[PDB]
């Protein structure tokens, strides 16, 4: 399948080179997989989710996304027009308030929730969790991330937007998950993207168009936008049977575009998410 | 716009 005039990020994921406009992907599109977007929530009513999105847990008075962030990330995972895995099942877990903030205890709780909740969802092709959030180093947050991964979930987390080594940020610094950096349209490391040895992969993160609340759309930047590309790619690949939740991150790294990014510091992988789709 | 938030670590 081919999506013409797709967001640059989608087109980059199905290309060996930057600057293309079509997103090529297998028609299965992540059917049968499930992705938990652990964020500010998901506007499930947005037409772009076509009924494939549902809120399953909130740690606040309401399950509504009063911010937009969570909706945008969910959109990049699986909305019709802006998503990597267009047929995946989206589950919203609101651990961030409407200002985009959340206590670590709450974020930890959300991760444990997903580890248990998946045991009662129908996801024959696998489960993925996308965490476009982060803060200072925390052994407890990292352990929660590691537990979620160990439980059988493909965890993708943002590297952080501090233009620094991700070793000082959580859950970015947890080795066993998939830590994602951001890149721009010209294959440059996003100016704000964290780097370092703990990074596993890069995804499109600068000027990323996706869904927003109020049934709208908008472009924003962050490692937060790169993360759901990798989460969506994992789901896509798991549905195709190419990999599993436990191995998806290294499978994506194995098959990434190599050596294409600029301003990558010594000690950081030069690998960019790639679906290797051959019509 | 990007990321989220921190502290406490349960």
Q: Which two tokens stand for residue A279?
A: 């019509």
Q: How many domains does chain A have?
A: 1
Q: Which two tokens stand for residue A101?
A: 């903030």
Experimental technique of record = X-ray
Give residue A82's domain range.
1-279
Buried residues in A3-32 as b, exposed as e (16+ CB within 10 A): beebbbbbbbbbbeebeeeebbbbebbbbb
A84 neighbors A14 (Cβ within 8 angstroms) = no
SS3 letters across A48-89: HHCCCEEEEEECCCCCCCCCCHHHHHHHHHHCCCCCCCCCCE
Q: What torsion do the CA atoms of A67, A73, A76, A78 make, to the nearest 10 degrees?
A: -100
Q: How many other C-beta atoms are found inside a 10 Å radius of the C-beta of residue A197?
A: 13
CATH of the domain at A25: 3.40.50.200
| A102 in reach of chain B (CB within 8 A) | yes
Count chain A–chain B contacts defined by CB atoms under 8 A. Answer: 72
Cβ within 8 Å, pair B10-A105: yes
Cβ within 8 Å, pair B6-A220: no
Q: Which two tokens stand for residue A258?
A: 């190599």
Partnered with residue A195 across adjacent β-strands are A165
Question: Resolution in A, one decimal?
Answer: 1.3
Round to whole Å and give the CA distance between A149 and A143.
10
């Amino acid at each position: 399948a081919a999506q013409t005039n797709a967001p640059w990020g989608l087109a980059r994921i199905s290309s060996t080179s930057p600057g293309t406009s079509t997103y090529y992907y297998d028609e299965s599109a992540g059917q049968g997989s499930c992705v938990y977007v652990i964020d500010t929530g998901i506007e499930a009513s947005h037409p772009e989710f076509e009924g494939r999105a549902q809120m399953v847990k909130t740690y606040y008075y309401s399950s509504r996304d009063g911010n937009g962030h969570g909706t945008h990330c969910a959109g990049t995972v699986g909305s019709r027009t802006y998503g990597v895995a267009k047929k995946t099942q989206l589950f919203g877990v609101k651990v961030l308030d409407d200002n985009g903030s959340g206590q670590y205890s709450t974020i930890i709780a959300g991760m444990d929730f997903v580890a248990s909740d998946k045991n009662n969802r129908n996801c024959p092709k696998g489960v993925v969790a996308s965490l476009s959030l982060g803060g200072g180093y925390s052994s407890s947050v990292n352990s929660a991330a590691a537990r979620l991964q160990s439980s059988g979930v493909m965890v993708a987390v943002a590297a952080g937007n501090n233009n620094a080594d991700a070793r000082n940020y959580s859950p970015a610094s947890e080795p066993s998950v998939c830590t994602v950096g951001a890149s721009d349209r010209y294959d440059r490391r996003s100016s704000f993207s964290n780097y370092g040895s703990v990074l596993d992969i890069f995804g499109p993160g600068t000027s990323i168009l996706s869904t927003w609340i109020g049934g709208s759309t908008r472009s924003i930047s962050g490692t937060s936008m790169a993360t759901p590309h990798v989460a969506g790619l994992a789901a896509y690949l798991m549905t195709l049977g190419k990999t599993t939740a436990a191995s998806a991150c290294r499978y994506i790294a194995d098959t990434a575009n190599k050596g294409d990014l600029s301003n990558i510091p010594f000690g950081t992988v030069n690998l960019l998410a790639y679906n290797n789709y051959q019509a | 716009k990007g990321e989220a938030d921190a502290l406490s670590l349960d």
